[PDB]
Design an enzyme around this catalytic site. Structure first.
Site, mmCIF file in Angstrom:
data_model
loop_
_atom_site.group_PDB
_atom_site.id
_atom_site.type_symbol
_atom_site.label_atom_id
_atom_site.label_comp_id
_atom_site.label_asym_id
_atom_site.label_seq_id
_atom_site.Cartn_x
_atom_site.Cartn_y
_atom_site.Cartn_z
ATOM 1 N N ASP A 72 -8.512 -0.592 -8.037
ATOM 2 C CA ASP A 72 -7.812 -1.018 -6.801
ATOM 3 C C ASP A 72 -7.308 -2.448 -6.897
ATOM 4 O O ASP A 72 -6.332 -2.793 -6.152
ATOM 5 C CB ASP A 72 -8.753 -0.853 -5.634
ATOM 6 C CG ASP A 72 -8.065 -0.672 -4.327
ATOM 7 O OD1 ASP A 72 -6.811 -0.445 -4.302
ATOM 8 O OD2 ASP A 72 -8.773 -0.690 -3.366
ATOM 9 N N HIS A 122 0.827 -1.245 0.000
ATOM 10 C CA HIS A 122 0.000 0.000 0.000
ATOM 11 C C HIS A 122 0.849 1.278 0.000
ATOM 12 O O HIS A 122 0.754 2.072 0.828
ATOM 13 C CB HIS A 122 -0.954 -0.032 1.154
ATOM 14 C CG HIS A 122 -2.108 -0.951 0.963
ATOM 15 N ND1 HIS A 122 -2.184 -2.169 1.584
ATOM 16 C CD2 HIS A 122 -3.216 -0.825 0.169
ATOM 17 C CE1 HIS A 122 -3.310 -2.760 1.200
ATOM 18 N NE2 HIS A 122 -3.953 -1.951 0.321
ATOM 19 N N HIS A 173 -6.039 7.493 -2.969
ATOM 20 C CA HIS A 173 -7.064 6.628 -2.302
ATOM 21 C C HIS A 173 -6.505 5.866 -1.104
ATOM 22 O O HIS A 173 -7.337 5.353 -0.327
ATOM 23 C CB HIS A 173 -7.768 5.684 -3.251
ATOM 24 C CG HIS A 173 -6.955 4.473 -3.526
ATOM 25 N ND1 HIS A 173 -5.897 4.515 -4.369
ATOM 26 C CD2 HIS A 173 -7.069 3.219 -3.123
ATOM 27 C CE1 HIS A 173 -5.336 3.294 -4.407
ATOM 28 N NE2 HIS A 173 -6.029 2.471 -3.688
ATOM 29 N N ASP A 174 -5.192 5.689 -1.000
ATOM 30 C CA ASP A 174 -4.583 4.947 0.162
ATOM 31 C C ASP A 174 -3.566 5.808 0.960
ATOM 32 O O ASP A 174 -2.673 5.240 1.642
ATOM 33 C CB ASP A 174 -3.894 3.688 -0.337
ATOM 34 C CG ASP A 174 -4.805 2.455 -0.395
ATOM 35 O OD1 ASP A 174 -5.721 2.307 0.450
ATOM 36 O OD2 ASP A 174 -4.563 1.674 -1.274
ATOM 37 N N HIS A 212 1.575 1.518 -5.715
ATOM 38 C CA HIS A 212 0.136 1.136 -5.756
ATOM 39 C C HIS A 212 -0.740 2.313 -6.154
ATOM 40 O O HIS A 212 -1.649 2.165 -7.017
ATOM 41 C CB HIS A 212 -0.250 0.549 -4.429
ATOM 42 C CG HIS A 212 -1.715 0.320 -4.325
ATOM 43 N ND1 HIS A 212 -2.341 -0.638 -5.058
ATOM 44 C CD2 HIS A 212 -2.646 0.868 -3.543
ATOM 45 C CE1 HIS A 212 -3.642 -0.676 -4.702
ATOM 46 N NE2 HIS A 212 -3.845 0.243 -3.806
ATOM 47 N N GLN A 216 -5.783 -17.719 -3.523
ATOM 48 C CA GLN A 216 -5.945 -16.855 -4.740
ATOM 49 C C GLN A 216 -7.145 -17.316 -5.574
ATOM 50 O O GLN A 216 -8.014 -16.429 -5.947
ATOM 51 C CB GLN A 216 -4.621 -16.766 -5.508
ATOM 52 C CG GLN A 216 -3.568 -15.932 -4.742
ATOM 53 C CD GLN A 216 -3.934 -14.481 -4.808
ATOM 54 O OE1 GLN A 216 -4.189 -13.927 -5.897
ATOM 55 N NE2 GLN A 216 -4.151 -13.926 -3.607
HETATM 56 C C1 LIG Z 1 -5.196 -7.582 -5.996
HETATM 57 C C2 LIG Z 1 -5.479 -8.455 -4.815
HETATM 58 N N1 LIG Z 1 -6.228 -8.043 -3.774
HETATM 59 C C3 LIG Z 1 -6.222 -9.056 -2.895
HETATM 60 C C4 LIG Z 1 -6.923 -9.140 -1.640
HETATM 61 S S1 LIG Z 1 -7.868 -7.764 -1.071
HETATM 62 C C5 LIG Z 1 -8.919 -6.929 -2.276
HETATM 63 O O1 LIG Z 1 -8.672 -8.166 0.138
HETATM 64 O O2 LIG Z 1 -6.978 -6.551 -0.898
HETATM 65 C C6 LIG Z 1 -6.802 -10.342 -0.944
HETATM 66 C C7 LIG Z 1 -6.052 -11.452 -1.418
HETATM 67 C C8 LIG Z 1 -5.932 -12.663 -0.540
HETATM 68 C C9 LIG Z 1 -7.010 -13.640 -0.874
HETATM 69 C C10 LIG Z 1 -6.817 -14.838 0.040
HETATM 70 N N2 LIG Z 1 -5.721 -15.533 0.245
HETATM 71 C C11 LIG Z 1 -6.054 -16.529 1.117
HETATM 72 N N3 LIG Z 1 -5.206 -17.486 1.684
HETATM 73 C C12 LIG Z 1 -3.817 -17.328 1.699
HETATM 74 C C13 LIG Z 1 -3.403 -18.696 2.138
HETATM 75 C C14 LIG Z 1 -4.433 -19.122 3.121
HETATM 76 C C15 LIG Z 1 -5.653 -18.441 2.661
HETATM 77 N N4 LIG Z 1 -7.329 -16.480 1.431
HETATM 78 N N5 LIG Z 1 -7.828 -15.414 0.741
HETATM 79 C C16 LIG Z 1 -9.207 -14.957 0.686
HETATM 80 N N6 LIG Z 1 -5.365 -11.387 -2.641
HETATM 81 N N7 LIG Z 1 -5.499 -10.145 -3.357
HETATM 82 C C17 LIG Z 1 -5.045 -9.765 -4.573
HETATM 83 C C18 LIG Z 1 -4.152 -10.626 -5.459
HETATM 84 MG MG LIG Z 2 -7.342 1.097 0.650
HETATM 85 ZN ZN LIG Z 3 -5.678 0.580 -2.718
#
Ligand SMILES: Cc1nc2c(S(C)(=O)=O)cc(CCc3nc(N4CCCC4)nn3C)nn2c1C
Ligand SMILES: [Mg+2]
Ligand SMILES: [Zn+2]
Length: 312
Positions: A216, A67, A105-106, A71, A268
């Site tokens: 985002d 962040h 935004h961040d 970004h 993912q």
């Molecule tokens: C652009 C981008 N935004 C994000 C966000 S966000 C929008 O919340 O900011 C979260 C995530 C993580 C997702 C995730 N990972 C896992 N695990 C990791 C191993 C155990 C579980 N569970 N979950 C739900 N990736 N991501 C990406 C590539």
């Molecule tokens: Mg944010």
């Molecule tokens: Zn952001």
């Protein structure tokens, strides 16, 4: 007068949705000004005030893994690509407001979720009980707009200034992903029952909210090597938050537990299926020329599937 120009490869590739702004931090301000000047005009902002604004914005992003200032500019470029693919759909004030909102935004993000701030009992969690970090980012944005020589909107009327700060406030609040799930369902319903109306202000607001979520999340719309290396930064933050949850005596969620490093590929998948693909699908229904974001998202989901199959 004084156009910004980019080397040839960047001049051509900056127009594409999957562009990566590169590792040369010192070119990011010029890239942003380049995008303002094409999406908005050389007339939108006084160059000196704009430059000064961009540099104070940079100074107020922290050296955290994800962040950070890269970004900000990345999310601003995705907005640029959306605006340029949908020339006639947006007002002059929206063109003005949305690249600024994206850069801002961040602002002053600390690498921790709203949830961690509430559990730590950070002062910000008492000042702003929902969308904690996002109300903070908008507050930092107003602060910087009020520094001497930083009022990039000084040529707008009082009412036009109030409107642009309101586009920016709403665009920044909409980056609180807790708000996206409902925004996206409402939009899915309005589009399908055909009640979606771009002359209705509360409808534009929703469509600009979705655009904000799409910019985002735009890490998932890049070339696979970019997507994959950006995930490393995203998790570096989540895992530090997990550590900090364990220090307060709280089991973090799996997403934030570095002991679950090995499940990343499956985490993912769930994320592409629950958040990313729905986001770019609804956005492509509302704004058909954004389809390359959905296509790139689907290409990256299929790369994560390969990683699970041991083909990668
Ligand atoms: C652009 C981008 N935004 C994000 C966000 S966000 C929008 O919340 O900011 C979260 C995530 C993580 C997702 C995730 N990972 C896992 N695990 C990791 C191993 C155990 C579980 N569970 N979950 C739900 N990736 N991501 C990406 C590539
Ligand atoms: Mg944010
Ligand atoms: Zn952001």
């Amino acid at each position: 007068l004084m156009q910004f120009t980019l080397p040839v490869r960047l001049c051509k590739e900056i127009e594409l949705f999957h562009f990566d702004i590169g590792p040369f931090e010192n070119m990011w301000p010029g890239i942003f000004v380049y995008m303002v000047h094409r999406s908005c005009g050389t007339s939108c902002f006084e160059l000196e005030k704009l430059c000064r604004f961009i540099m104070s914005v940079k100074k107020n992003y922290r050296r955290v893994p994800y962040h950070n200032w890269k970004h900000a500019v990345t999310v601003a470029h995705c907005m640029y690509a959306i605006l340029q693919n949908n020339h006639t759909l947006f007002t002059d004030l929206e063109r003005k407001g949305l690249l600024i909102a994206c850069l801002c935004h961040d602002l002053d993000h600390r690498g921790f979720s709203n949830s961690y701030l509430q559990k730590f009992d950070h002062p910000l969690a008492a000042l702003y009980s929902t969308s904690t970090m996002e109300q903070h980012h908008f507050s930092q944005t107003v602060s910087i707009l009020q520094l001497e020589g930083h009022n990039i909107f000084s040529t707008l009327s009082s009412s036009e200034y109030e409107q642009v700060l309101e586009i920016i406030r709403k665009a920044i609040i909409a980056t609180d992903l807790a708000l996206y799930f409902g925004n996206r369902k409402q939009l899915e319903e309005m589009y399908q029952t055909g009640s979606l109306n771009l002359n209705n202000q509360s409808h534009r607001d929703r469509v600009i909210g979705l655009m904000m979520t799409a910019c985002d999340l735009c890490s998932v719309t890049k070339l696979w090597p970019v997507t994959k290396l950006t995930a490393n930064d995203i998790y570096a933050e989540f895992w530090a938050e997990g550590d900090e949850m364990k220090k307060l005596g709280i089991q973090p969620i799996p997403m934030m537990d570095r002991d679950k490093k090995d499940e990343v590929p499956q985490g993912q998948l769930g994320f592409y299926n629950a958040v990313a693909i729905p986001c770019y699908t609804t956005l492509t229904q509302i704004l058909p020329p954004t389809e390359p974001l959905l296509k790139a998202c689907r290409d990256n989901l299929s790369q994560w599937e390969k990683v699970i199959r041991g083909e990668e």
